[PDB]
Amino acid sequence: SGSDFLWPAPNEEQVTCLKMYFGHSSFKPVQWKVIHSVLEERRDNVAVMATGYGKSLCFQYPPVYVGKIGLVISPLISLMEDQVLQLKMSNIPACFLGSAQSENVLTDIKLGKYRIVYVTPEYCSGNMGLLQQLEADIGITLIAVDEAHCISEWGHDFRDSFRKLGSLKTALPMVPIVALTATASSSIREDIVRCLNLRNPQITCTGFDRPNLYLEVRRKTGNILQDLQPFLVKTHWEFEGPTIIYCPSRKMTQQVTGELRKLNLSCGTYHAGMSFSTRKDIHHRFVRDEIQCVIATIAFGMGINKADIRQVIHYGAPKDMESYYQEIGRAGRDGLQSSCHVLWAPADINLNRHLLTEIRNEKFRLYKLKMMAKMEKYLHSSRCRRQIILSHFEDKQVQKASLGIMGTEKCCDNCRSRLDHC
Ligand SMILES: *CCS(=O)(=O)Nc1ccc2[nH]c(=O)n(CCC(=O)N[C@H]3CCN(C(=O)Cc4ccc(C)cc4F)C[C@H]3C(=O)N[C@H](CC3CCCCC3)C(=O)NC)c2c1
Ligand SMILES: [Zn+2]
């Protein structure tokens, strides 16, 4: 909560604002990433949130914190009016601006008395000069475009009223745009970036429970082949399916690869010491199944994009929950059943607090120590693995919306253990 597991850390005024105006004790990680990128980098965002829950804070918090104006563009009239009501209940001045609004409300908006102004895309397109005046006189913290996938002619819910939003960025090039959508289509996402003319946006995709990922944590034996043989099938050996093994160091990547090659397994390594071309080559041979297993040290699994990854193994404790989340999310993109196993020991590199002693920035040292503790608590836990992840990353509505995976044999090792004999 507060500033605990977030870097850069929210400052005390930011936490106070969150408590006082939104009634929350913590930012979720994606919410902080959006908010911070807006406040400090003035950066465009595309935020895909699978359920739609949790997006409001991303565009409401920044203008409230800095005391300026946020514009929210949406076609969902009744929901916008609802949100205006809720804001005013929290002492946040907000209004829904349209043609029928009085010149006194318009003057109040020009005077900066409203933190959050909701408009339809049609009104917005008809009143660009007003928006520019608000930017010149007060400063627009961000423009939020909800239902942003509606700008795409390739999607099923295109609205003509969204086309003209392409001019926001040319009329207001310094104002960040936060485009929000629930649609998990990569091409719709690219279309949003293109049609809104966003500039190097931060792109985030969150809000999933990933029902086809089975989660398990096992202790290491200390013998690499003894540890990995359960993931192999014999008669010669091979992996059960395409596999990524994440290792915390290049030395361990080389050790693991050497051991697996003793069994003539088709492997490739993948780390930052390689040329961009060499890593592309390994990625391509993995995609076409010339290699069955990639052993990698690259953070987040960046660049390992393959539809049918059936197994992810973390060989050693992961670095922290954010890297773990990104790295196992690489699995099972085709929707078929996959498994994500961590093999760990308390002596693992990513749990060695002595490696943090020399950090000079006190706030960063605390962040790294908190992230180690949180990772270790996950690995040692008896609780549902998926519930731990969703509680850390998602707000409570997302967790409650999850249906049909948690508590079943397909969810995780701890859920399985609570169904079997205990
Ligand atoms: C959502 C985009 S999409 O168009 O639907 N396509 C998609 C689907 C699946 C993917 N797997 C991937 O590796 N990638 C590429 C990178 C991502 O977009 N990663 C996303 C989605 C996958 N993911 C998870 O499933 C994590 C996960 C694991 C276990 C459970 C129980 C739930 C769960 F969600 C990871 C996720 C991701 O890494 N998100 C990044 C942003 C967050 C990082 C952590 C801190 C908060 C922000 C991100 O968007 N990075 C670019 C896809 C693509
Ligand atoms: Zn579970």
Side-chain angles (χ1 to χ4, degrees):
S1 62
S3 44
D4 265 346
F5 308 98
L6 301 172
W7 189 260
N11 65 39
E12 267 144 304
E13 295 72 27
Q14 288 169 325
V15 176
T16 288
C17 181
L18 188 65
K19 319 261 203 209
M20 199 206 311
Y21 289 105
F22 297 88
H24 285 116
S25 49
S26 52
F27 308 90
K28 296 295 169 184
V30 66
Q31 294 180 321
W32 180 240
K33 295 202 185 296
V34 175
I35 288 162
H36 180 84
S37 70
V38 167
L39 292 172
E40 304 298 333
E41 302 162 41
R42 315 298 292 142
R43 193 177 177 192
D44 295 328
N45 276 255
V46 181
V48 182
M49 311 191 143
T51 59
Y53 300 134
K55 57 194 181 186
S56 272
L57 191 70
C58 298
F59 58 79
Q60 291 176 348
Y61 180 91
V64 169
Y65 176 64
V66 300
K68 304 296 190 56
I69 297 183
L71 186 73
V72 179
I73 299 165
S74 176
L76 308 178
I77 304 285
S78 59
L79 172 54
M80 276 184 293
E81 295 170 341
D82 284 348
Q83 294 196 338
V84 167
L85 275 193
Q86 267 93 306
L87 292 161
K88 290 189 291 199
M89 279 153 58
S90 307
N91 293 331
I92 298 167
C95 68
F96 173 58
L97 170 59
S99 77
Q101 277 286 15
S102 53
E103 186 214 346
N104 289 327
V105 174
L106 198 33
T107 298
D108 270 358
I109 296 171
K110 296 187 188 168
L111 291 174
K113 287 173 194 166
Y114 287 100
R115 290 290 152 274
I116 297 170
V117 182
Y118 290 83
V119 298
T120 65
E122 294 97 339
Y123 185 94
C124 178
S125 295
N127 294 274
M128 288 297 320
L130 164 73
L131 302 193
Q132 291 178 308
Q133 177 169 357
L134 297 182
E135 162 61 17
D137 284 353
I138 306 307
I140 303 179
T141 305
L142 60 85
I143 300 165
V145 175
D146 198 18
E147 301 295 281
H149 61 278
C150 292
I151 200 166
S152 171
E153 217 145 355
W154 306 92
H156 264 273
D157 198 8
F158 174 75
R159 301 171 177 264
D160 221 301
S161 58
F162 275 66
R163 234 193 282 263
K164 300 182 138 165
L165 298 186
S167 49
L168 289 168
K169 206 70 189 174
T170 64
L172 296 162
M174 73 282 302
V175 180
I177 291 175
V178 174
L180 309 146
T181 174
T183 72
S185 165
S186 63
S187 70
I188 294 285
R189 192 177 73 242
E190 301 172 327
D191 218 16
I192 293 175
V193 171
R194 164 172 77 78
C195 293
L196 292 174
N197 295 304
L198 304 185
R199 291 308 200 100
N200 187 37
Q202 177 173 240
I203 294 187
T204 57
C205 186
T206 60
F208 308 105
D209 56 353
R210 299 305 303 281
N212 62 322
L213 298 191
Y214 168 78
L215 305 179
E216 179 168 308
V217 177
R218 311 177 65 72
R219 286 285 296 270
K220 285 165 161 178
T221 70
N223 181 283
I224 292 174
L225 288 181
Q226 181 181 341
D227 286 338
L228 297 174
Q229 254 156 30
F231 302 90
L232 306 178
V233 47
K234 204 184 175 178
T235 300
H236 84 144
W237 304 80
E238 82 151 47
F239 276 96
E240 266 263 332
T243 299
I244 301 171
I245 301 173
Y246 295 105
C247 297
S249 64
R250 287 185 217 175
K251 157 153 109 156
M252 184 53 62
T253 278
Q254 294 300 333
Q255 272 175 59
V256 166
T257 303
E259 288 313 287
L260 294 172
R261 279 166 177 165
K262 292 182 182 172
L263 285 53
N264 297 123
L265 293 162
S266 190
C267 306
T269 63
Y270 189 91
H271 61 74
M274 295 176 174
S275 84
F276 192 78
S277 294
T278 300
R279 283 190 323 245
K280 175 183 193 173
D281 189 63
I282 292 293
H283 177 245
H284 290 341
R285 295 179 196 276
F286 190 38
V287 167
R288 77 181 184 172
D289 307 309
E290 183 192 328
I291 65 176
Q292 195 168 24
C293 176
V294 171
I295 305 88
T297 69
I298 208 97
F300 313 154
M302 285 307 308
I304 310 185
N305 291 308
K306 176 169 167 62
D308 57 331
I309 292 175
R310 292 280 71 85
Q311 180 74 57
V312 164
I313 307 171
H314 275 87
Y315 194 71
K319 194 179 95 150
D320 55 52
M321 292 292 288
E322 290 191 12
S323 58
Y324 175 62
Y325 179 91
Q326 304 176 70
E327 285 156 6
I328 65 175
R330 298 279 167 188
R333 289 170 71 167
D334 59 11
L336 303 175
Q337 181 70 242
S338 299
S339 295
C340 307
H341 284 70
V342 181
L343 273 41
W344 76 293
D348 280 353
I349 284 166
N350 285 330
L351 305 178
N352 183 350
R353 279 74 165 179
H354 298 278
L355 308 180
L356 304 179
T357 299
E358 306 290 30
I359 291 169
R360 262 289 254 165
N361 181 327
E362 293 183 317
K363 303 187 306 171
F364 192 59
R365 195 194 308 126
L366 180 58
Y367 166 76
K368 296 291 287 183
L369 290 160
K370 287 254 178 179
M371 284 312 242
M372 283 199 179
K374 179 170 262 290
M375 190 71 255
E376 183 161 30
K377 303 336 146 195
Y378 169 81
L379 293 173
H380 194 93
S381 184
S382 297
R383 301 170 193 177
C384 170
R385 311 288 185 190
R386 180 170 262 98
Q387 180 60 63
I388 301 175
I389 294 166
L390 294 171
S391 283
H392 180 71
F393 285 97
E394 305 293 345
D395 76 7
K396 292 65 48 201
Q397 311 180 237
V398 180
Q399 318 171 31
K400 288 263 202 322
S402 182
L403 176 80
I405 179 61
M406 286 191 291
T408 73
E409 270 159 15
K410 293 60 57 168
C411 174
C412 69
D413 52 354
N414 287 334
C415 283
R416 276 187 190 177
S417 80
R418 267 184 281 276
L419 289 157
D420 285 349
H421 211 221
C422 316

